[PDB]
Amino acid sequence: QKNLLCGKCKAYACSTDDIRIIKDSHHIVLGEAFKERYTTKPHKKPMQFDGFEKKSKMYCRNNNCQHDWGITVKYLTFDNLPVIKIKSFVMESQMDFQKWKSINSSLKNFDVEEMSNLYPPF
Ligand SMILES: [Zn+2]
């Protein structure tokens, strides 16, 4: 439905249709195209209480920007899963993504069967 932009440089980030919510907290982004729009630096940690194993920090790929976009994690069998920092984004016009969430219907919940269809284990 709507597009998120990097809050610092305004480069296109992703669509709200791309976002899934895990455990009513984590905002993950579906699709391999999104991975073209950020870079990462390693920051591996063992599993935390909710089953996220941190792998990296995400940065806007605009080299003049490099805004903190979030982290990537492994959750279940899904590695390199981007978890966006919702404070880091604004909406295409200008309101920020946190404001937009507050006045819009809830985003779609994560569905493991949908995820498995998109990223099959074979
Ligand atoms: Zn940026």
Side-chain angles (χ1 to χ4, degrees), residues 6-11 60-62 65-67 69:
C6 181
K8 181 173 171 183
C9 76
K10 316 305 181 296
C60 181
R61 194 162 168 197
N62 172 349
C65 175
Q66 302 185 47
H67 196 39
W69 275 18

Side-chain angles (χ1 to χ4, degrees), residues 49-66:
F49 72 98
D50 57 7
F52 273 13
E53 194 167 274
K54 189 174 179 180
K55 299 299 179 182
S56 81
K57 296 186 192 195
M58 305 172 48
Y59 303 92
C60 181
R61 194 162 168 197
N62 172 349
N63 195 67
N64 307 125
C65 175
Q66 302 185 47

Side-chain angles (χ1 to χ4, degrees), residues 93-111:
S93 60
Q94 186 165 60
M95 82 186 342
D96 69 16
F97 181 46
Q98 190 87 257
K99 178 67 176 182
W100 183 91
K101 282 167 58 62
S102 76
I103 63 175
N104 280 280
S105 308
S106 303
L107 296 158
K108 295 183 165 190
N109 285 334
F110 183 81
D111 173 341

